Amino acid sequence: SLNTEIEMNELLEKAKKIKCLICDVDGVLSDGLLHIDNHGNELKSFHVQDGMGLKLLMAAGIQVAIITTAQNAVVDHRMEQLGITHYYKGQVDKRSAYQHLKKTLGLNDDEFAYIGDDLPDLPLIQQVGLGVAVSNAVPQVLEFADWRTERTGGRGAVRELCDLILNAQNKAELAITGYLKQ
Amino acid sequence: SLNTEIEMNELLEKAKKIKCLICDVDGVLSDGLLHIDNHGNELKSFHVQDGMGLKLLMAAGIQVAIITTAQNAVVDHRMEQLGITHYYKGQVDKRSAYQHLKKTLGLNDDEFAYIGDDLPDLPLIQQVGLGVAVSNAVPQVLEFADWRTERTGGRGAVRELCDLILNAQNKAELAITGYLKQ
Amino acid sequence: SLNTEIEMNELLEKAKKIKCLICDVDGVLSDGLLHIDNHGNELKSFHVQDGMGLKLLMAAGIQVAIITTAQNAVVDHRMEQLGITHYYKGQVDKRSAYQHLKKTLGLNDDEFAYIGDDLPDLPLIQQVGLGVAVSNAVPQVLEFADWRTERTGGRGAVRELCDLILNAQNKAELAITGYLKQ
Amino acid sequence: SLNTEIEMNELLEKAKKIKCLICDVDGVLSDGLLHIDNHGNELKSFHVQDGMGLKLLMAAGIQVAIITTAQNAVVDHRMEQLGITHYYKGQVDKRSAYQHLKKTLGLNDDEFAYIGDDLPDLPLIQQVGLGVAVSNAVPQVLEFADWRTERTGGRGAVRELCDLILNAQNKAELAITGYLKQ
Ligand SMILES: [Ca+2]
Ligand SMILES: [Ca+2]
Ligand SMILES: [Ca+2]
Ligand SMILES: [Ca+2]
Ligand SMILES: [Ca+2]
Ligand SMILES: [Ca+2]
Ligand SMILES: [Ca+2]
Ligand SMILES: [Ca+2]
After folding, report:
1. Residue C51's Cα: distance from chain center in Å?
2. CB contact under 8 A, D43 and C37
3. Region D1-182: CATH code
């Protein structure tokens, strides 16, 4: 209809500006599960299509960052795997890490996207240019985000956002070409 | 309709009284799976939104307790992570642990909520003020509970109950504010 | 309708005779997944409601057995957890293990139930009194079984069969009572 | 309708020619998840029905190969379990491995099937006789494949392709017979 075209255009205009995507970890890059053993070892589960999404953004000159409440070494191992250097762990209130990232990169609020699932993500989701909820996000986060993914956290929701941004900016071909050559 | 309004109000009136939520572990705080390796190590998988749910109740002055048949050290590690001190392990029949918790806290039956999935939860679900079934509960538990969650165990069902209670008591803002300041 | 009543009765008459349930492991007591690490350690994931199902059958005097192609020690650890002594590992063709179990127990073919998901289960599913497919079974197994569960393997499908058998035989109350007293 | 019959026949004619199935690993033989622990150990999860699918192809004289970007030892352990000798790891661009496999086997492009989920699979999916997308594949891969499975990667999608090929070639009975005799 007329309304879905308008809304689709307004979303595309937000995504056209994006120079950095920020992700939360648990519930967004993961399914939300914390796997714990009898000895207290911990694991999380990440999805390969999301890891490819982040690598495609970076191949296209779009920066990637993480801001998480998680503190464990699983996060460090995953960030190292993906070559993500801008990341912040143990952040219970996330506003201060966002402001630090903003200073580091020199970007306007509207040049960030942020994808979240729970209440501590809410102020970042409302502040940035493109605030995104995974489909399994808590009710307030689904309510107040600019957009929500079809897929759930850890199942390709972050890839869906990566592809939206690349497509909006006509960088999808650049990204895969650049990725495949490294 | 008239009937859904009445029922919604009756549920809210139960939730308004709640001073302690009691959870079962396997099938409720987890998906129900027991992951076992070749050496007999075991793991369970918990969900971060449920862990946040429990922390929000506690930030709002609502106590949390666990009563489980599980005996393994996974449970202890998770309870320590969440700062939950009232918990009972290896309880095959759960009535005696409930009565002990009741004595410890000094609460009326109707000031407890209990969220369960299987037959040993049934007498507790029927006795407390707000007896809750996860959506994947066995048929009798779904039948006799006061309410059932939309979500399944380990996927945010306990968070859905936490949010119902906080919302009923107008403590949702208090809870997130209090959480974010620690 | 008339037809669903007939079929429901014919299924109940099969279940009334059952003196032993036989389960396959991978895909039936599990989701089907084999979790493998970098060092070749392996895990499988079992569901607590299915473990309770098997314990309820045994509390009601119904025997339980496993016949599996799996050979790894995960299976032994799980059987020990559940107190299941009649079980057969590494059986690629399963007919010979079934005949051995039949000799051991002294039962007629029609006093066995068998729940399976893949082609090597087919001859057992067709031979026993109550041959059952998990809902995620391969197409031929769904086709030729007497009945299929609503739930998938490792998610409570075996419990659904346990409850059908107990209900048919009016042993559900006996079973939970007997379980809760040990 | 007339159109679904034509398309079903055209798909069957592709599958009749197949002398080798090539699979990707992560997202195709797995759910896509990478499970990572605090020490950097990694696991993936494979599905037993897919492992049986591959063994049935091989019992019927159809070769199996893997081409993956994954480099970790999980892959080697799984290939050894399944007796798959033709496989290629760490391939970021996959075209060169395909050409090497083609030389090794002496087959025409149209005698290969390939099942994929992400952009680096696309040129192989378009080149081979039967290019297949798992149902959870990224949008371009779903778009350009000859066929897509109903099931998702790691949940029996590869088995669904194995069964299509065996059925098209009237080798399903040969395959199970041959499997069950080893
Ligand atoms: Ca989160
Ligand atoms: Ca906004
Ligand atoms: Ca339970
Ligand atoms: Ca009640
Ligand atoms: Ca099986
Ligand atoms: Ca039969
Ligand atoms: Ca892949
Ligand atoms: Ca093609």
Report:
1. 11
2. yes
3. 3.40.50.1000
